[PDB]
Subunit: 236 residues, 6 copies
């Protein structure tokens, strides 16, 4: 096998890949948005697919939950499969008083409570930073689609079930717009390979007000987010 975690052969992935944590959502994206679609990985149930969107080759694959999981899959995609661009497409919480459930968030950079980026930069602060062409393509696609967006910082945590007092209030004070678990691991790997990455998320929950998106609102926001991401790939 080409890697321990992926049965695809080199060339099976397109130069652009959308990734989400849930492999079953990767399948939904392929089934509903890709033509000419082929399954190219099923190791560990981490479904990956390659097809076309409006004529342009594009892949979609799950990445599992957390920085260590996406780090395995994205390192392999850049190094072995010679992918050029990964766009994470996910869901998030927010703490920002002016971000609301249903909102689409385009991520410019992501903080974290992980040690993985300190280990890359001699213990210093290494900002996990989205590629500007990717951010711009997402922003411009949303505008062309008449979809409002929030643009700004995410925070990637190792612990879904947080017990940390003061954190939410500090993230709100500095207007972090998205809380999730992966993007801070993706961007430095893109950098290491001289490649590109970005992230776009829909707000499922407001962590401070406790408001939560209905299933119908989650469908609406998913439809918005995925169309933005797909249209962005045509410009990348």
């Amino acid at each position: 096998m080409a890697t321990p975690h992926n049965s695809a052969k080199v060339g099976d992935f397109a130069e652009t890949v959308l990734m989400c944590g849930d492999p079953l959502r990767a399948k939904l994206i392929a089934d509903n948005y890709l033509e000419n679609a082929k399954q190219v990985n099923s190791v560990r149930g981490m479904l990956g697919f390659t097809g076309t969107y409006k004529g342009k080759p594009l892949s979609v694959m799950g990445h599992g939950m957390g920085i260590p999981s996406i780090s395995i899959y994205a390192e392999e995609l850049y190094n072995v499969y010679k992918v050029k661009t990964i766009i994470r497409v996910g869901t998030c919480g927010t703490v920002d008083p002016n971000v609301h459930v249903r909102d689409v968030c385009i991520v410019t950079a992501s903080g974290t409570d992980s040690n993985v980026n300190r280990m890359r930069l001699l213990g210093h602060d290494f900002p996990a930073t989205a590629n500007f062409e990717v951010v711009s393509a997402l922003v411009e696609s949303a505008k062309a689609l008449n979809i409002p967006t929030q643009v700004g910082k995410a925070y990637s945590t190792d612990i879904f079930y947080s017990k940390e007092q003061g954190l939410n209030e500090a993230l709100a004070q500095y207007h972090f717009i998205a809380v999730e678990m992966e993007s801070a691991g993706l961007f430095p790997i893109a950098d290491y390979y001289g490649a590109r990455a970005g992230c776009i998320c829909t707000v499922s929950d407001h962590i401070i007000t406790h408001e939560s998106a209905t299933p119908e609102e989650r469908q609406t926001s998913f439809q918005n987010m995925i169309k933005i991401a797909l249209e962005a790939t045509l410009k990348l």
Copy 2:
């Protein structure tokens, strides 16, 4: 749903759960070793099953790759599903000069480069420590099966594709016997809930000398480890 990541209802998991990272391997264990197994979760493809082993209820479920992933699943099992004992079963690398491929490693405690345990203990050193009854049950089960074991420390890294110079040499100097990615996240969660956890792994690679277990040898030592864990559950 009972949790965001698991469709099982309260009561659908036995008090003892074996977990491995690969959900397809969890299905293999259920199919080949569990009697009257029922699938109880398939959210995110993270297959989980509940049946019996020699009369005694037992569950098996995937945990994904890395500390953040196993923390979600194990927190839920202990908190929502009222699980009492989780035994992780996996493969590992080793750096120890006296540990060899195909060896079976029983983990007493696990180091890590993750921040999750410092965050639990006011920034101090918190040893991720296996429960002694679980360790001893695994040790005694292997003795009963006349399967040699190595008993000692593991190291759980966040980064599969390590670029860290001098790490392997330090791990070998202090006789770490197993290198993997999850056990250091599991043991403190068990502690928080007053529950039990342990880990048993087979050596598929020597990181220093580069020996690697053939496909045939990996299947044999998997069968050894799993029988050890299954017989251990009868004592727990």
Copy 3:
């Protein structure tokens, strides 16, 4: 005085301010590019000025050397003087193999060896992140002017006379384009006040290859950068 370090009365700064380390360079910018210009600060020699550029109010003020210095001046501008946008303009070194002396760098985010951002976010990684609209205005201005630019990460150090082995190689490995001393301190303050910041630098020295820009090249570089910034203010 309205603050301990600034003799300006409230309302004497425009909502958009350009800032550079050298107060004499801020004077040179007011003299050569602002009309209707008046000196508004002289405390500690940190000259600041307010006039118009192409009809629109604009200010320009020195910020001194280092994160603590720009933090003092920026905090006051956002808090006391109600400034909305700060664009830092300056010079930098580079370690990136594909960046060369005389290049113009637009900063999307900045790493650092300072502790100021960890202190804002409970010890965690807080990416010092430029405002996207500001980044975009600078990119678009350079395009209209047919000035090539590099867009990416900076690294803000406390120590001009570095003695640190391995830092330059790690910065180059992850494609940091600019090394300077202030921007990582500016962006989180803008965040705190719900305001906007960015940074644009010209490369004076390649830290690795040792190439270095002549004074004629350095004036040509400054003139391009400052035109890019001034034209961007018209769209902000």
Copy 4:
């Protein structure tokens, strides 16, 4: 002298050494439980002795207070004097809601607020872990003596007179059973030399409820603990 802190000559220590913090207690142990005891060290008043227990060679020596002190003496014992097994014996506090004054605690691993173990493992989490054969020999000895035991984690602090808010509550949340000052420094040195170590302590104080053992209870607890340790040496 063979070491700067020990006048004994190589061969003067038995392969198994009991160590306690107070040298006067080491003398008490030698006088009351060892046969044919001889004093082999008195440098710095840190009395050490060698004799037999039930005819098996055994030594007993003081180690002084805290991680730096025990590190000096243990390092020398393993390296210069070729000792193979050290069992630390002493008293501890507890925070665990279900551990009580007079309880006997057998230590599986120890956390710490010391830096010494980070310095051994490139800044990462290195669990100070007792040797499993030593743990089991202590556990089994107590069973043969019909003495109940608590088996679990200790916490070794550098600061007896703690002023740290929230520490006890977090130690209790994660079921740390013993608070003392040395074991976290002993176990990694044993690892370095490919040797064995363990720790057994009796509870003198409940840190949270403030119960305290009377002088008479402390003597009784010590008698139970030292017999468990001595009998364990016969199995090692």
Copy 5:
């Protein structure tokens, strides 16, 4: 220029240099206390001057605000300009209960929230320590002038506009007498060059009780402090 930040030529600075944060205050000291004074630098407005005090050559120069700023100017002074002694002269706040506005503080050592000294000593605690001969010269000069002094620790912060809860209370508990922003950056640079540094400050503000010095009191305080420092140079 001799350095990017100083146009002075080698030999233009005396062996002893007084430095303060505000360049205009440096000009005041030169005009009012130095005989035959010449300006030797004005790069970035950072005025420096060389003259004589009661016959002995003496310079005085601004160093800007914060550790990174003083680090540049002092590193150059010791290295390029071969200076032997720097005395920082400044204002400070205090949190000490027994220190009052108008007090004169002679600094023996300085704590900090900067990273710059950890980076010099492999991440460990490196006390920024004043030269004893300089401290002694200051104390004795004040005695000779019948001006009471306070002698003790300072704390150098990167953030003038502190939001940190608990800091002042801890500084008070351990009897830090002065809070400022530079001295902990100066002392280790003097160490690197085998040279001497000290600091003296007048209390302008009590951080805890909120007393503040009047215009008249600032004047007589600065006159007291400068006379102390100037007389001290005679013994150095």
Copy 6:
């Protein structure tokens, strides 16, 4: 007992105490330099004595090896025994190129690899600083005795058997004059109690050149150091 580690009654210790690591050396100091001496502690063999030097009550006591040990004894002396001044009288290695074996070192401040002082000051740099009246009494006593001294920084390590590369070279670069194991823990405790501490050490070894004091040199330097300390007590 008055404390868990000291059988002295309150009042038994004079307001000034000399302390050294070796209790047998404490006894030598009392036997040879104190009149009217009586032993006041023997718990844990940590001998302490009170008598007079030149008519003035003075005590001398061992403190054991390492920051944790001296912290226990010093905290108790200030808090329970109402001691006002502690002078550590010790031996050290040096790394400084201009410091030689046999030299006497008066410590102005001490760095460390211990966490104890970060824990006192919210994780920041807390310089362990000697009290200026004690430093000055020691310096002036040596002058009065025509004994030359070195004055400057110590470094207190937790690990006698250091394996740390680059440490000695950094300490030498910044002209640390003494390497030992305790002073950094003593000075902050004095601060907490509003009390006084200092340290004076004899150089037994050059860590870099490997020179070592002969017996005769150690006697000469010991006699010098102790006479300095004793005379200084008369002025304190």
